[PDB]
């Protein structure tokens, strides 16, 4: 293909959801919302990564939404642009 995901295994939303098993208790966004936006947990802090573009986000703040943060920071991601 002409595009290729940074993490093919995390292609699956269910695989992304499972990655949040040890998502920290202070991290306010839900695994549901994050996984739906393409994001999976890297295992460090509140840091997540997109399976598609490979961008990483951390230090979530109140009012942040997963999709709007993903699109603001990585607007050329194919998952963002395929939504």
């Amino acid at each position: 293909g002409t595009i290729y995901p940074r993490n093919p295994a995390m292609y699956s939303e269910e695989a992304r959801l499972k990655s949040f098993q040890n998502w920290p208790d202070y991290a306010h966004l839900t695994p549901r919302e994050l996984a739906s936006a393409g994001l999976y947990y890297t295992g460090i802090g509140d840091q997540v990564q997109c399976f598609a573009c490979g961008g990483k986000l951390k230090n979530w703040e109140p009012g942040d939404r997963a999709w709007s943060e993903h699109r603001r920071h990585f607007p050329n991601c194919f998952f963002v642009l395929g939504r």
């Binding site: 961008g55 986000l57 230090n59 920071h73 990585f74």
Partner: peptide, 4 residues
């Protein structure tokens, strides 16, 4: 949030 911020990018890494």
């Amino acid at each position: 949030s911020v990018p890494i």
